[model samples]
Target: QRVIIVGGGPVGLLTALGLAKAGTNVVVLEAESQPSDSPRALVYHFPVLPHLKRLGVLDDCVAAGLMRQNFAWRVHSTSEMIFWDLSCLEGDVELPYALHLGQDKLSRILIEHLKALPNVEVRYSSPVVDCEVGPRSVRVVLGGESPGVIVEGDWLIGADGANSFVRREVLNQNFFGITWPQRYVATNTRFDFDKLGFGKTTMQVDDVYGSVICNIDADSLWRVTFMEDPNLPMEGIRGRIDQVFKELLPTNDPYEVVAFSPYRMHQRVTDRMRNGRVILIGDAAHVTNPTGGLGLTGGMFDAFALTSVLNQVIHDGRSEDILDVFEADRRRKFIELVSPRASDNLRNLYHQKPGEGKNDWVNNTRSISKDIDRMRDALRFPETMETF
Candidate 1:
């Protein structure tokens, strides 16, 4: 059986790898002429690390990123410490901590590994224009400077991203959710936080602005992100980098700004994952705020789960009803883990006032710290299942 996967991002490439490992014929179509060069998502949670290790890419991720044993949340303006030395739940898992490798690096590694697969074909600069879904087969129209061509497949997976044409045109699914009132301005810099000895992830709640600083690498490269008011232009806020840092950081030193991006946070999910012979995966299926690093992790989970179910159907000749089960399980998992947590995180980061409610930064941090077991239960998936 032939399968076509659209979008060559981390999710699509990982899906291709998993399909090839299952000995299925797979072809990947990517719209971009080259891999992404910009820094996107950087945090991979404890749950996804095992999959990365199994795929033989975890070491490269670890080498490219930094792992922190604990994350700290503090209200620096008030000198209040919410949580300190909060460790992740320990188990037989090979990688327990979050890795801070940029998404570009992660995608490149996955793409390289996928290229080595004999049954997988990588098509760059090829955009899927249309999909003709049939009862027993599907035909995809590919458009590029070379020419438009049609390829037939037994099944198709769309990981095209937030603005997915497959989800809209092929699946005929409608997304339901609201866009965030604020956008995030992210800037990577060679900022030294070691002098202050900050934790791996630091959330600062101040009177002027609220911000998050993450240590992406030991080379003093940090990701500084702040909420951009919807009323203001992102470029207008770049000029205020010094003011933002002064408010969040304890001191200002010589630093190099590597890159800046303004991202709009949205909480949306497709009404369904399956449309006859077509399926949606990754960002094409759901989107969440980046506050808690749920976007990529969720997408990775989708890829892992969908590939498992699809492989059973394609290789073992399992019942196609399993596709419905896959959709149900993954959608439920997304609701349980990503939806509420990301919403809470967005509220904590963007909606909270400086010195306002009792549920402010200090209290929120205390709640998360005090209920470590509950947080673990909520975020952690069961080990018995290969995919959720």
Candidate 2:
């Protein structure tokens, strides 16, 4: 195979789509028997939507997802709202709103698209057990089947996840970052946000706690995520759903809970991207708190950058030295654009004390809102297209 992608997640599938479009032979090995069923990671940023459109999955995304036009920042105790309207940045893009769809749905669309390509192959229920990096190619061991098979590829991409086997075994690198003392609890509920008339995203800040509520689906399904003291056992607070709702919302309304999950927030990145012909992408490369919705978006950006450089190397006979450029550019972009934004967002949404006051948060929001152009240029980086 020209390329071996370990992990059938969004990053892996999208990487396959990019490689196959470039006429490269690619294989994806996944441990899971099927796609994820949970409602995880719903927000797709403006930058990623354009790429997905090129891959032919944007239509499905728009059909199944909600178009988030605006987000609100609210004072926890008093519920003072600060709105940021994204519609003001319209006219240049095909879709103005950030697309909100379940990760599983997006993965399914990519999987179907990959299957249609003759050069791409997906092997489900196949976990990569061992990987040996050779001088010119890498050999991978696939377990969970009769007589474990060995496959060789010119290049290997690890899109497995944060606990990536390839990153740990092959790269021999340690992930560096701080894990928050708080655990976030997320749930999908039948909430009437229309009656409340809140925008797509809302951040509620308070002394005792901080929570975020986002309308993810058009079926009146809302995702509520909040952080709690790590010292407090989840069992002790799991039944406080009603109490949480009462504290966060202005009305005394009830909601039907669909699903719940608790996750830890960690800010960390890999030490390097390229160890010879092996590269890491997505959660395999970095994992961050879901504050600014940067974790998924950043991984997708990695896929785009890696594939672009690899295409030049394979098709245009560019120097393999260009791989160093890919590594440097993506690492710099992640550190500058995604990591700090997610960290600051986490502080604003979860770390601030409830009753301590909302003035600082309000001031920060106002400052960000006022210098929207500068902030956009910093985050989007208009002149960095060459890097990808």
Candidate 3:
């Protein structure tokens, strides 16, 4: 089977890696000449480690990141502790801890492994300009990044991005959802978050800006993500950088800001995950707020599950109509499972006041803190939620 995939981020390459490992021919088109340097997602839940193991990159990924077993939810105002433990899950699953690896570095690792596979061709700087879908195949129009130009494949995968060209052009589906009032910002800096009475992997629900601050790498460089007033201009946003950092600091000493990026948060989901000969995965299908690290984790799950169904149809001679199941189940998982979880991740963190639970989320966290059986039951079933 020949597959043509648009985009070369972690999700796209993950799709390509799975297919190539199965001895299928795959072509990955990336607009950038190099893998992204941006450190977007930092943590992977236990659910994704199973998929990474299938891709044969789990050990490397674990080595690249710290095994984060401790995540605390505390009151930003008074630092009162809530349920911050996952130790109760030690024997219930294959992985009991979350891994902290940057998305950019994971892309590079996948790229390196893909280069060695004889059946895969990864074309950098080659963006998919047009896609012609036929009953039998897809003709992918591409720029002249390499000697290889146009590509005809049995299937097309749009693992592009949130603003996916494939979904926009080929499927003609609008991204439908309400945009949050505040613009999201992620900053990588060397801040003394621990000294400020924060855990190494702390997520203070409704921290001053209702954000999450945690370590992205083993180097002690942290990623602090928060919502700011949307009306603030770029300069206005930059102007508050020092103040935000200072507010988090226990002392008056300065912190070194390494990288800064601003992104808009949305609860958007596409109409579907497939259109005839084309398929969508990752951010191409859904997007979530970064509050709970559910964005890329959901995409990685799609990559594994989609590859399974595609292999069934192409190599095993299953009915092409089975693609209907592929589209439905994948998208359903997003709407039913991924979407609501991430929404609540932001909502539960934001809606509550300083000291207590107005809803079940805060009350449950409070309850689990004091109840061992409750914490055990909760931790045994790990969570990690998205849409398409």
Per-residue CA lDDT of candidate 2, range 1-388, in tens? Answer: 3899999888888888998998999988888887775646778877687788887889988887777777777776666777776665675556566788888888888888887889888888888888899877999888865138887899999999989998998888889988988778888878887677676877776545576777878777888877676776778565776677777665677777888887877888889888788999888888888876778787888888888888888788899998887888878877776688778778867766634345765676767766867445433532243244
Clashing pairs in 1: none
TM-score of each: 0.90, 0.91, 0.92
For each candidate, the alpha-carbon lDDT, in order, equals 0.77, 0.78, 0.77
State the weakest 10-residue window (summed lDDT) of model 2: 378-387
- For candidate 1, the C-alpha RMSD (Å) to the true structure equals 2.8
Score candidate 2 by lDDT.
Answer: 0.78
Question: Can you tell me which runs of candidate 2 are displaced by over 4 Å?
Answer: 91-94, 145-147, 234-237, 354-357, 363-387
Q: Write the per-residue lDDT of candidate 3 for residues 12-50, one digit (tens) a residue.
A: 999899888888899899877877767487788876777
> Model 3's lDDT to the true fold?
0.77
Which number leads on TM-score?
A: 3
Give the per-residue Cα lDDT of candidate 3 at 307: 80
List the candidates ranked by TM-score, beginning with the highest. Answer: 3, 2, 1
Best by lDDT: 2
